[PDB]
Assembly symmetry: C3
Homo-oligomer: 726 residues x 3
């Protein structure tokens, strides 16, 4: 039985005195403000509902939340203690405390929380009582907690805040160039009460030893750890069932003689899990139960969906992923925070994963600047066949080499690894040379708790000039994990997040100068007035491609989104076209975590920029594309599947209508195939790529010539090409 | 109330490598100058006491915990250098955005450079690109040029 | 008051590499012999109790904490050897400069060397250059030569003996040439012997089997024995007999087979490793430690 403590709570907040409040008495004696609160939630959401703060998504309202970083937060509610039978255990489960808090049950402290990113379970069996009980949580200022530490030289001056270095919180919450500064606080995930039996399952760890797709066989290991009273030894059995849609695959029963056991399961009639393109994402319900031999009473049951696959990181960013023995070409996006108030992440996960399914990503890199996503995110990636590269939660900086930080990081790593090691989508852990953190603490955790996945102790930003400069086109990285280009968001998003007088970007009507609110949406971390900076990437990249920056807002949106769309499509066509040497491209990024101006290709409110649709047409399983060649161009077809296909391709000049090429092609599986050389066209213009495979039509294009182009002429070529809207 | 340093050694079990060296076995488990137990160039005089100053210091809630000056680069021909300041402070949150750091490089009262910046967080890196500054050299290889580096935490309103 | 060893294992969360090995998962986080939980050559009999001697000891303020004998060099032809004594004591400061260390190397009552030194610090290294002494060899390559080594702390005024430590040591050097080869006294030796397993599932009866079980190795003409990591550490008498009968000892630590990489297990193992090493590092029969 699980009993949700989510719902309406009482939240009292006040400035933190020099001595932090930590007791129930001190919290009730402090001068503060009391409002109703929702759990899971963030304190700013409750405050906005109480009319105490203004919408931080709009204008410069993010800076008005600054004073609350030095506040404390006192959650309170009462609950009904469940009935407990002799030997049973009552556990208070916290999915997320943000962050430094003292937890009390009936005036008795039961725990001191100190990590935003992991669960916190407290055995409260002996401190509860009949009738109404009392739960009180007293949070301290996360920012002020940093001054309890002395920083090393390496932890000062990085892009990540010095306040983040000694604490275990998501680094992006202190502000980033793609995330607002919104430290926040609160119980941002579920709070539940759980009753456990003296016979219970501690952990069920499913490991794929081998898979044989052609014979439809696989060897799965179950590493089972349990709590078992000794007079229950030789009197309880495990019931292991693997099923798919109800149809059973395996039933194995074993007498429980010791508390931990390795059960090897050799299965037949099982399909292998594959990433998108390379096969189906076959999943199987794995269920383990502890059952009394005599009465048949079930003491515990653990159920999940597992997948049978093998992963090997084959080094030569000079590496390629080997899935089930086949070398896969990765194409996907980096995953950034879904919301600055992370209690709303769960409400965004399903639609955000749908962005990747429609994009046809086969991989996603969960950026270490974000929290660790919850189980549902990985369940969706298992279901839709999206490989997951998981960073440990550390942004862009250096960290302490001392013991106290290593102990906190070790505890976090053990928690998250044991939590996620059973998802087939997860394929890699990353630490993000003498560093103790990335070469000892994390590697020792992967060594003991997940020897099945590779651990990694590439990033193409740089000058961010013309996307055809040799910085990009001659970078020798086989596998890139970060690469992006700026694009102004859609007008409807601009009008929603800016004040009416600030929708038009030009300060004093001077093209190229940004008003103060656009500067805030850079993002700008602190309210410090200046001109230029990150926003100038938009105008600089527009000026390179189109000669001049349009003054009209609609013309500027189209020009900016066209440069982002052309650049990102070019990077993906450049890596797909140079296989087998190129092994993967993880681009940045697919979705904003806050209404901002960014290099993402779709904004926080779901507004897709032109890059999303361009990218979608170069992300197909089998994609015809054109790459520049010595003299002229080259028509290629790239196949990211294990199947051969045949089709017909036609290339025409959009302006004149002249046919450039027409013929048939065979696309051999999992490789790039060169179709035909294309002769050099004169001047500037656009080629349209039409091809048909299995009675389905597909469309691509190639922009030839050299910049600068004329914006209205490029807009004419897009409309006459007939593929994308304007 | 000070105890016997010599008798403290017997609270530890020594490893083989810590026995038989010219350093005394009494010195192996303690953090004291090894020569105090005796050397070929120093007498044995274990001694004890408060051998350096004892003071009382009054600090404000806003205070400089550490000022770490680092030379990134130096160009003696151009009389230039790039000096970083790694500054750590104690800063009550109410003092955030209300205090500024005032950084001064000077030589015999003549101000070489002044930089001011608002304290928005407790720890910061400030990089100073200096002109008209000579490098520091050991004897024979040049002059031992020194410069007064000062940092203060000043209230932006009251000037405190 | 002893509690259940099996139930203690459920106070630890195990890593994957500690689940599914031949040794029991109950054995992974606890410092016991893995064979007590069962093996292919040993029954499952966990047992409990005070399985070795319980004694009450009275020590003087001046006492010997450890006498560590180390063979620096040996010359079997010239019948010479250099032996080092790493001596650690408890010494009240009033007894500084008032106690002396008396060291006697003898054999069958015949004194080989006697050395006296005033105790001016609690820990000292004494180097002894002995003449007229033979080297210790394993069976076949020579005689298992042993000499009685005695160290006493004596009041320099009254002659009162505050403590005395006595053992039989052997002068020998051991080197491993690295798929390796043992080098005793500069000579490569061929190893031939047995693996020592538990002498009894109820280990309190081990001490009564030692004499007859070592005789078996003597009649076999073993020159080496490897104590298996699944067993307990043998007591002093086993190594004394291996000294007397010239049987080299390969000592496994009590591992079974992968264990925790975390701090708690590492502190418990270092505590055990230091205790066992200090206890056995003076026996000439011991030639090699192994992680097993």
């Amino acid at each position: 039985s699980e009993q949700s403590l989510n719902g309406r709570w009482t939240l009292k907040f006040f400035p933190q005195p020099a001595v932090p409040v930590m007791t129930i008495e001190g919290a009730e004696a402090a001068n503060g403000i009391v409002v109703d609160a929702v759990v899971p939630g963030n304190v700013e959401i409750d405050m906005e509902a109480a009319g105490l703060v203004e919408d931080p998504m709009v204008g410069n309202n993010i800076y008005k939340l600054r004073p609350y970083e030095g506040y404390q937060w006192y959650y309170s509610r009462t609950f009904a203690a469940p009935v407990v039978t002799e030997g049973q255990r009552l556990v208070l489960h916290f999915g997320g405390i943000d962050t430094f808090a003292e937890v009390y049950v009936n005036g008795i402290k039961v725990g001191s929380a100190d990590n935003m990113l992991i669960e916190h379970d407290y055995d409260i069996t002996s401190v509860v009582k009949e009738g109404e009980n009392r739960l009180d949580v007293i949070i301290r200022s996360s920012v002020m907690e940093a001054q309890n530490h002395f920083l090393g030289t390496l932890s000062i001056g990085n892009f990540s805040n010095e306040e983040s270095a000694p604490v275990r919180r998501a680094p992006s919450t202190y502000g980033w160039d793609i995330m607002p500064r919104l430290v926040s606080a609160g119980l941002w995930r579920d709070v539940t009460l759980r009753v456990e039996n003296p016979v219970t399952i501690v952990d069920a760890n499913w490991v794929t030893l081998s898979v044989n797709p052609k014979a439809r066989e696989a060897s799965e290991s179950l590493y089972l750890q349990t709590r078992l009273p000794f007079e229950m030894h030789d009197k309880v059995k495990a019931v292991i069932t693997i099923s798919r849609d109800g149809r059973q695959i395996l039933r194995k029963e074993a007498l429980m003689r010791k508390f931990a056991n390795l059960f090897t399961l050799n299965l037949s009639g099982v399909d292998a899990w594959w990433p998108r393109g390379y096969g189906e994402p076959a999943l199987y319900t794995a269920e383990v139960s502890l059952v009394d031999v005599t009465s048949g009473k079930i003491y515990d049951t653990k159920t999940s969906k597992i997948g049978f696959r093998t992963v090997k990181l084959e080094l030569d960013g000079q590496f390629q992923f080997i899935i089930n023995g086949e070398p896969v070409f990765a194409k996907g996006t980096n995953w950034v925070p879904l919301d600055a108030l992370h209690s709303r992440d769960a409400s965004h996960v399903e639609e955000a994963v749908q962005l990747m399914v429609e994009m046809n990503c086969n991989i996603v890199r969960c950026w270490g600047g974000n929290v660790y996503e919850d189980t549902h995110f990985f369940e969706l990636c298992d279901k839709y066949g999206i490989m997951v590269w998981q960073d440990f939660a550390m942004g862009c900086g250096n960290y302490s080499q001392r013991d106290n930080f290593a102990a906190a990081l070790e505890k976090e790593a053990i928690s998250v690894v044991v939590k996620l090691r059973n998802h087939p989508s997860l394929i890699l852990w990353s630490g993000n040379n003498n560093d103790r953190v990335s070469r000892q603490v994390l590697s020792r955790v992967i060594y003991e708790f997940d020897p099945t996945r590779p651990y990694l102790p590439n990033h193409l930003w740089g000058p961010r000039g013309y996307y055809k400069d040799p910085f990009y086109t001659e970078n020798p990285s086989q596998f890139v994990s970060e690469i992006g280009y700026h694009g102004c968001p859609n007008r409807e998003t601009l009008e929603r997040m800016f004040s009416p007088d600030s929708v038009n970007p030009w300060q004093n009507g001077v093209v190229g100068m940004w008003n103060d609110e656009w500067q805030t949406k850079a993002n700008r971390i602190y309210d410090d007035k200046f001109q230029g900076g990150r926003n100038d990437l938009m105008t600089n990249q527009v000026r390179i491609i189109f000669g001049e920056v349009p003054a009209d807002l609609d013309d500027f949106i189209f020009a900016s989104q066209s440069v982002q769309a052309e650049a990102m499509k070019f990077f993906v066509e450049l890596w797909r076209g140079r296989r087998p040497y190129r092994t993967g491209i993880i681009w940045w990024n697919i979705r904003d975590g806050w209404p901002l101006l960014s290099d993402a290709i779709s904004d926080y409110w779901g507004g897709k920029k032109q890059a999303f649709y361009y990218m979608q047409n170069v992300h197909h399983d089998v994609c015809c594309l054109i790459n520049p060649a010595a003299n002229g161009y080259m028509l290629k077809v790239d196949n990211n599947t294990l199947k051969d296909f045949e089709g017909v391709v036609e290339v025409k000049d959009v302006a004149s209508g002249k046919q450039v090429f027409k013929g048939k092609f065979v696309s051999k599986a999992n490789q790039m195939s060169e179709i035909a050389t294309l002769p050099m066209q004169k001047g500037q213009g656009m080629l349209v790529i039409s091809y048909r495979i299995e009675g389905n039509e597909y469309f691509n294009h190639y922009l030839y010539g050299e910049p600068p182009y004329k914006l209205d002429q490029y807009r004419k070529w897009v409309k006459k090409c007939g593929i994308y809207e304007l």
